[PDB]
């Protein structure tokens, strides 16, 4: 579908058998979720944004369904104040910007 | 035009008679630029992101040209590490998300 930007581009995602809401975010290279229960191993990480840096857990090859589109890829989990879908998954679901 | 997300969606902008590069960013409600010389009055402000909060200067009704599309609107200026175009201007240039 097409989505306009008069409101936040929020979508429903399924990950780890849990349902969540997340922001389609073209300015994020990576996908970052608030703390949640995930299975398997993780690598410790740091990412920066406006405001300063956060330590996150990098999870690889995780399956995620994004407004019904499956994707598999890296998901970082940590103190973000908003669930964010970044370019690493946006490309896999065929998402593009048009103006 | 259409832009895919395998790379950062960076565009050229003109603002205050200066040329800059900026990130098309669907997860930003507002437009935020690194420190720059702007004319006229500004209001003091605070915005939050991943990482913590920043104080910014809110400038209103500023003209900005975004990859050749004019827009007029609020522009926040401050310690952001990347020039960001947010939804308040993305809608004015007719930008949309498609998947
Ligand atoms: C009040 O109006 C606002 C306008 C913008 C923002 S935002 O914080 O800038 N925002 C939303 C966010 C809090 C989820 C937009 C978001 O796309 C930003 C863009 C950004 C990126 C880098 C610096 C400042 C702004 N965003 C992106 C990410 C996650 O980013 C990454 O995937 N990692 C890269 C990375 C990793 C280490 C160091 C620097 C960077 C730059 C990144 O592109 N978090 N927020 C908040 C309020």
Residue A50's closest CA among B48, B24, B34, B88? B48
Residues spanned by the domain of B37: 1-99
* Angstrom distance (rounded) from CA B67 to CA B70: 9
This structure's resolution (Å) is 2.0
The whole-angstrom separation of Cα A23 and Cα B26 is 8
CA dist., res. B47 & res. B14, Å (int): 23
Going by C-alpha positions, the residue among B7, B19, B33, B30 that lies closest to residue B66 is B19
Nearest CA owner, ligand 1 atom 45: A49
Give the separation between CA B8 and CA A1, rounded to whole angstroms: 22
Closest CA to B41 of B61, B63, B59: B59
Burial class, A7, CB count within 10 angstroms (exposed 0-12 / middle 13-18 / buried 19+): exposed
The domain that holds A73 is classified in CATH as: 2.40.70.10
Chain A interface mutation, best of B28, B29, B50, highest count of A Cβ atoms under 10 Å = B50
Q: Which experimental technique did the depositors report for determining this structure? A: X-ray
- Domains identified in chain B, total number: 1
Contact A27 B27 (CB under 8 A): yes
């Amino acid at each position: 579908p097409q989505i306009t930007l008069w409101k936040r581009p929020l979508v429903t995602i399924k990950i780890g058998g849990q349902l969540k809401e997340a922001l389609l975010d073209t300015g994020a290279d990576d996908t970052v979720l608030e703390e949640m229960s995930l299975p398997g191993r993780w690598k410790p990480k740091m990412i920066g944004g406006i405001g300063g840096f956060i330590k996150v857990r990098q999870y690889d090859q995780i399956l995620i369904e994004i407004c019904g589109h499956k994707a598999i890829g890296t998901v970082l989990v940590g103190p973000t104040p908003v669930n964010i879908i970044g370019r690493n998954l946006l490309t896999q679901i065929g998402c593009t910007l048009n103006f």
